[PDB]
Design an enzyme around this catalytic site. Structure first.
Site, PDB file in Angstrom:
ATOM      1  N   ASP A 130      -8.622   2.387  -5.030  1.00 14.28           N
ATOM      2  CA  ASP A 130      -7.748   1.250  -4.838  1.00 14.28           C
ATOM      3  C   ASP A 130      -6.967   1.127  -6.148  1.00 14.28           C
ATOM      4  O   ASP A 130      -7.498   0.621  -7.158  1.00 14.28           O
ATOM      5  CB  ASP A 130      -8.621   0.015  -4.556  1.00 14.28           C
ATOM      6  N   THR A 131      -5.731   1.619  -6.152  1.00 16.20           N
ATOM      7  CA  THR A 131      -4.896   1.551  -7.357  1.00 16.20           C
ATOM      8  C   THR A 131      -3.979   0.315  -7.288  1.00 16.20           C
ATOM      9  O   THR A 131      -3.801  -0.275  -6.211  1.00 16.20           O
ATOM     10  CB  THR A 131      -3.989   2.779  -7.484  1.00 16.20           C
ATOM     11  N   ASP A 166      -2.132   6.610  -5.612  1.00 20.76           N
ATOM     12  CA  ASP A 166      -3.130   6.892  -4.579  1.00 20.76           C
ATOM     13  C   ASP A 166      -2.683   7.834  -3.467  1.00 20.76           C
ATOM     14  O   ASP A 166      -3.398   8.005  -2.495  1.00 20.76           O
ATOM     15  CB  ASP A 166      -3.587   5.573  -3.934  1.00 20.76           C
ATOM     16  N   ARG A 213      -1.503   9.485   7.012  1.00 20.50           N
ATOM     17  CA  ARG A 213      -1.831  10.224   5.802  1.00 20.50           C
ATOM     18  C   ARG A 213      -3.250  10.779   5.972  1.00 20.50           C
ATOM     19  O   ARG A 213      -4.101  10.094   6.557  1.00 20.50           O
ATOM     20  CB  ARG A 213      -1.759   9.291   4.577  1.00 20.50           C
ATOM     21  N   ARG A 228      -3.729  10.396   1.340  1.00 21.28           N
ATOM     22  CA  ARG A 228      -4.163   9.170   0.689  1.00 21.28           C
ATOM     23  C   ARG A 228      -5.504   9.489   0.023  1.00 21.28           C
ATOM     24  O   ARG A 228      -6.430   9.950   0.692  1.00 21.28           O
ATOM     25  CB  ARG A 228      -4.424   8.064   1.718  1.00 21.28           C
ATOM     26  N   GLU A 232      -0.420  -1.799  -7.308  1.00 23.13           N
ATOM     27  CA  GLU A 232       0.874  -1.485  -6.703  1.00 23.13           C
ATOM     28  C   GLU A 232       1.988  -1.180  -7.684  1.00 23.13           C
ATOM     29  O   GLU A 232       2.014  -1.694  -8.796  1.00 23.13           O
ATOM     30  CB  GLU A 232       1.350  -2.640  -5.835  1.00 23.13           C
TER      31      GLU A 232
END
Length: 135
Positions: free
Chosen positions: A34-35, A15, A81, A29, A37
């Site tokens: 929403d990737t 991400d 970011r 970002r 972890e």
């Protein structure tokens, strides 16, 4: 909204990518994704976390042209970011990740909602196909 040119410096995660933007290095970002972890103290590496990272990396590294597109809301997050839609040869990385079932769409609420339907479309399709995170 408008696309602004940039240069890949380094892929950092599924991400996040570091780019030369306006002649200075800046980390971005990817908006609304929403990737899973890959580097987390708690939990550690989530399933599809490495795959998502690999996908983003390959997509931006193989691109001839990278473009940054800020939305209408806040442009930087708390970690400094930039918050944007990133394009590789005209294809949006944020959408490609979601379409591949390698990220879910995130609701953020800071005025950056332009591509919500487009991303939700890609997401419903990945789910219908039971792809990766939806398998």
């Amino acid at each position: 909204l408008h696309k602004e040119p940039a240069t890949l410096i380094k892929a950092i995660d599924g991400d996040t990518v570091k780019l030369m933007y306006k002649g200075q290095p800046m980390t971005f970002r990817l908006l609304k994704v929403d990737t899973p972890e890959t580097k987390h103290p708690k939990k550690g590496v989530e399933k599809y976390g490495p795959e998502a990272s690999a996908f983003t990396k390959k997509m931006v590294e193989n691109a001839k042209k990278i473009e940054v597109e800020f939305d209408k809301g806040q442009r930087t997050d708390k970690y400094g970011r930039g918050l944007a839609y990133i394009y590789a040869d005209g294809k949006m990385v944020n959408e490609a990740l979601v379409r591949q079932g390698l990220a879910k769409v995130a609701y953020v609420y800071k005025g950056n909602n332009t591509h919500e339907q487009l991303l939700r479309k890609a997401e419903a399709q990945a789910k219908k196909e039971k792809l990766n995170i939806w398998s």
